[PDB]
Design a protein around this ligand. Structure first.
Ligand SMILES: C[S@@+](CC[C@H](N)C(=O)[O-])C[C@H]1O[C@@H](n2cnc3c(N)ncnc32)[C@H](O)[C@@H]1O
Length: 374
DNA sequence: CCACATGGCTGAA
DNA sequence: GTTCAGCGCATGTG
């Protein structure tokens, strides 16, 4: 009676999609399987392998000769020299393992109907808002190409049963809304019916304000077969959680010297964020706030002001640590310790990958609504 | 027009 | 090439 769920994670990062599925699998009587992934960012791949692998033992290895399109910064491709630098290191073994055991295809432009797995149960993806226009472009154009290709070569039953997009709130702005709607029409042409959700992490057992757009799609014949109905997730409001609830005790944190800066009382906004400004601190508004641990915090970003989240504690004002950032995205302590134990990812890079991820319990809630046939 | 609220990019080293 | 401290406005609601 156990149902094997084959998942394919495009732009997988550290695998918040896979983590969410593993977290609910037992309660669904599911067995989650890596059908494939696409991730080219070296530090995300290393971290993905650290978190999700079972019995992987790193060692010095030659990099597989076809692992050629990867990135050290996540934005730009690594040079022929940078590839040489990874070759014959422990780090290479992580990339080789992702290829061999998780079927990482690395670069979306290299994905086609010849290597895209058949009978995928859940296909997850994303794209930047610029991709909506020149007709699509960039990563979304590649997703569209792949869907076109598999549509023509696969039977309908071999095409992914469910698609899930995550994106930022700007996807529904005045400038992007219409073009996003045209993408949904295209998914329709491909045989998928979809539902757009705007969800805030704070409503899914988290102490973080984080509004994300999700487009859950179901293949239209599978909809008929299962009798699946979309759930109204935008009305869900679980009990609030405070920053206080995830903080880790330590006698050796670094506290910021803010003695030079004038401040005010804390004020709570409608979003349950409780903050106070620092005057003459910077000219960058988002950098100038200290947050109260009895409320929720701001959206964790990969870089910049919202990756340096100042909280007021009894011991002083400090940044949320990398561990606390993992917990803030609803990964567990053990996930963080596995990444830390690689000794390959710096503290700022760990925050960077956390800031790019998705709060895990939002995904648990979405995935809890899926229906599969026996 | 106003007040209020909220979330990456890049050049110097 | 890497790294991150320094830096502001885009996109809203009311
Ligand atoms: C915002 S993230 C998503 C992270 C993911 N949701 C998670 O669970 O951590 C988007 C990811 O897509 C990756 N990416 C960008 N261009 C890519 C390409 N051509 N091929 C593969 N991955 C790419 C980036 O490295 C980045 O980690």
């Amino acid at each position: 009676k156990i149902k094997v769920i084959k998942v394919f994670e495009a732009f997988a990062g550290i695998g918040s999609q896979f983590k969410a599925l593993k977290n609910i699998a037992r309660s669904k009587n599911w067995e989650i399987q890596h059908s494939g992934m696409v991730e080219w960012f070296v530090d995300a791949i290393v971290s993905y392998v650290a978190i999700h692998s079972k019995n992987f033992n790193p060692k010095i290895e030659r990099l597989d000769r076809d692992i050629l399109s990867i990135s050290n910064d996540s934005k730009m491709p690594i040079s022929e020299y940078g590839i040489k630098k990874i070759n014959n290191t422990i780090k290479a073994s992580y990339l080789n393992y992702a290829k061999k055991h998780f079927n990482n295809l690395f670069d979306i432009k290299k994905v086609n109907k010849d290597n895209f797995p058949k009978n995928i149960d859940i296909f997850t993806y994303s794209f930047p808002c610029q991709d909506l226009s020149v007709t699509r472009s960039g990563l979304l154009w590649e997703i569209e190409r792949i869907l076109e290709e598999i549509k023509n070569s696969f039977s309908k039953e071999e095409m992914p049963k469910y698609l899930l997009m995550e994106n930022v709130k700007n996807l529904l702005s005045h400038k992007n809304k219409k073009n996003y709607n045209t993408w949904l029409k295209q998914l329709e042409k491909f045989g998928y019916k979809s539902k757009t959700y705007l969800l805030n992490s704070k409503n899914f057992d988290n102490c973080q304000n984080r509004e994300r757009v999700f487009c859950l799609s179901i293949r239209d014949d599978y909809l008929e077969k299962t009798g699946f109905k979309f759930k109204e997730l935008e009305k869900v409001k679980n009990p609030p959680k405070k920053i206080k609830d995830i903080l880790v005790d330590s006698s050796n944190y670094k506290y910021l010297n803010l003695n030079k800066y004038e401040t005010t009382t804390f004020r709570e906004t409608k979003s349950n964020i409780i903050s106070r400004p620092l005057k003459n601190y910077t000219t960058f508004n988002s950098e100038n706030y200290v947050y109260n641990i009895n409320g929720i915090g701001p959206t964790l970003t990969a870089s910049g002001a919202n990756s340096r989240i100042k909280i007021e504690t009894q011991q002083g004002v400090r940044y949320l640590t990398p561990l606390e950032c993992f917990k803030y995205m609803q990964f567990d302590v053990n996930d963080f310790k596995k990444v830390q134990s690689t000794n390959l990812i710096s503290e700022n890079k760990m925050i960077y990958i956390a800031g790019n991820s998705i709060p895990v319990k939002i995904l648990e809630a979405i995935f809890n609504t899926l229906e599969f046939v026996n």
